[PDB]
């Protein structure tokens with residue numbers, strides 16, 4: 001039998017994803033079990049310092065996502081790697097996604113003229129209780145992998161190799177519950193959040209490139225800057241869950257507020273999770289309440305298909321509040337080709353929803369995910385630099 005401190009066995013340690021591609025990974029990539037979002041301040045003095053930060057991030061993310069033996073150096077020097085994952089780094093399904101904030105487009109690096117048209121500093125919503133220390137940032141990194149230790153090891157590599165260029169503003173890790181393999185012929189399910197409901201059922205088809213080019217990815221023919229093609233707006237919201245009050249809530253109230261059955265994830269007029277409700281035949285809200293979460297987030301009209309988003313959240317759990325209740329909730333992360341048409345328009349409709357009785361957004365921010373690195377001569381943010389050079 002294994003000794004107490006012997007490491008747990010994993011067969012997913014060589015899971016991997018391409019770093020290069022037209023898009024950055026970690027958006028349409030299948031979401032792994034561990035997630036982490038770190039927001040930084042860019043300490044770069046000029047554009048050359050920003051270029052060094054970009055090319056360094058490109059080199060570090062490429063190796064971290066590929067894995068391999070870490071070179072050994074003179075013992076008088078610090079180790080090249082933290083060693084959390086051993087002498088040979090394992091990918092372990094890791095993806096690191098880079099996004100730039102609105103504050104980066106100030107007078108510091110001359111990028112003000114090429115800012116994405118809908119990239120703004122996040123403004124608080126009526127139900128928000130935002131903490132300024134956990135809001136905004138020059139740059140955001142999204143770490144997703146099979147384990148939090150792979151994520152934390154990836155964070156340690158970034159901060160070690162960029163000590164004078166990156167200052168960590170705020171961070172929030174999270175996870176989703178894995179499930180047993182689906183039996184043949186039975187459709188798989190979305191992961192459940194800390195409210196007990198399946199999260200992401202009505203997400204657009206990530207296998208439909210036309211749908212992704214319509215909802216998620218900035219297209220070159222749009223009114224956005226030319227460099228921003230194949231990027232995406234990233235919205236982050238740390239939303240608290242008042243789980244004790246929610247667990248005391250009757251089941252029928254839970255389902256009538258969200259708009260879906262808890263067990264099956266089905267719509268109020270359907271039977272399976274993959275089904276969508278028919279609002280036109282229910283104009284008064286007898287089946288699905290007019291203030292349901294999914295009904296408010298998606299009226300499913302023709303005028304609302306421009307407000308669809310790709311949600312990619314995690315469930316977070318921190319300490320315990322002094323009042324006695326647990327600080328846990330949803331690490332909300334969603335992507336959209338248009339931030340104003342996407343998250344901003346949807347959250348506006350959700351304002352005042354009966355779900356707000358159990359929600360409390362306390363932080364997050366808006367960022368624009370840079371386009372993907374296409375080849376060995378491209379790097380993270382090169383298109384942004386070249387489009388703004390005098």
Ligand code: HEM
Pocket residue numbers: 193195197198199200201202203237239241258260293294295297298309330332343346347359
């Ligand atoms: C804070 C910003 C949020 C936005 C913009 C948002 C948006 C959406 C959207 C667009 C849908 C799809 C509805 C449809 O297409 O029919 C949805 C569904 C859903 N949301 Fe949210 N949501 C947010 C927060 C939350 C939170 C905090 C929770 C729970 C703690 C939650 C739980 C759910 C559930 C259970 C569903 C049904 C399953 C699904 O289709 O994903 N949402 N939401």
